[model samples]
Target: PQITLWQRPLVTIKIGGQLKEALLDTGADDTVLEEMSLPGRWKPKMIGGIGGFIKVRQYDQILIEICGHKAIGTVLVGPTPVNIIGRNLLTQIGCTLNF
Candidate 1:
């Protein structure tokens, strides 16, 4: 399989019976799921954000298809303090973003 990676403004995301077409950014390096954007079954951990701290919540793992490539991993769900996908998975997938 061939997978191409490039700078994309945003991509449509499927969650909670909704397809949200939004930008895919790497600047915010943390898996973030907005309170409204999270799926039904998600228990995100209570963690602190750069701005402030929040209650403990749970998370879930789902199939991710990026740049035509596929991956199965975790995605934080619940009220998010920020919108960012951290370097954890990026390093695993060998992704480099020059932004």
Candidate 2:
């Protein structure tokens, strides 16, 4: 999967609990925590995806591995089955999703 942040490729992040992979999307504006997979201090929220309004889970910072490189940032958990990461973070990292 290829995701773009700041026009660059997004990094692959591994969740702590479920040990799954999530894409880093700069287009996303919130940290999405997947269901039954997110870590601590997080909860789901109702929101849209790409464009349009929908109900999606959200949460706090989680222990994650980015790009299989490293873990950083305050994880915001979304429904485990849903998408992860948001623009709130990517805007800061200036990342690209070609990886």
Candidate 3:
């Protein structure tokens, strides 16, 4: 099965047993989620971008569900505008750009 990339490839996903919406961002190297409570230990990381840098909690080995596919990877929790499913999970789900 193939997935199309829209202006915003939005999809429903499960994180920490809770349902949430996320954008499939091929440009991103790691998944990033809006600030929220998550189980397990996380390390403090500073992410710099066009605007500025934001502090985030980098959690490893987090289980996530996307389009009925499950993957275990790293998820960054921070003040992101929206939840993002990055290359880490995309590769796990075999998602690749078709055009």
Candidate 4:
């Protein structure tokens, strides 16, 4: 299925059976989500962005659903101002740029 990149390139995604909207940021190398209950082990990580650096919980092999496509990949849970779907998870679903 083809998708259009909107003004923000937003998409509906599911995490832990919950539906949420995330920004499809191709410029970002990793996916980032809001703070949520994450099971298993994680490590503290610092991510720098427009607002400087922030701490995040790096969780691996998390399940995520995008555009009815299910994929398992890494997800970083943190106090992100907005949910971001980066290349890490995007590559799983064969995301490509079309001009």
| Per-residue lDDT over 1-99 for candidate 2, one digit per residue giving the tens place of the 0 to 100 score | 344345544345566533555666556666665545444554445676545665654444444555554445655543445456666656445555454
Query: What local distance difference test score does each model get?
Result: 0.50, 0.54, 0.89, 0.89
Candidate 1, residues 11-80, lDDT tens digits: the string is 4444444544433445544455565544447664666646776764455565444443444466655565
Q: Write the per-residue lDDT of candidate 4 for residues 1-99, one digit (tens) a residue.
A: 666754777789988889999988888999999988978799999999786999999999999998778888889989998999999988998889988
| RMSD, candidate 4, Å | 1.3
lDDT by residue (1-99, candidate 3, tens digit) is 666654567889997789998999888888999999988999999986668999999999999999779999999999999999999889998888876
Candidate 4 Cα errors over 4 Å, as ranges: none
In the order shown, what is each candidate's alpha-carbon RMSD?
A: 5.1, 5.3, 1.3, 1.3
lDDT accuracy of residue 10 in candidate 3: 86
Give model 1's TM-score versus the native structure.
Answer: 0.52
Model 4 scores worst on lDDT over the 10 consecutive residues at: 1-10
What order do candidates take by lDDT, descending? 3, 4, 2, 1
- Looking at model 1, residue 75 earns an lDDT score of 61
lDDT of 2: 0.54
Question: What is the alpha-carbon lDDT for the whole of candidate 1?
Answer: 0.50
lDDT of 3: 0.89
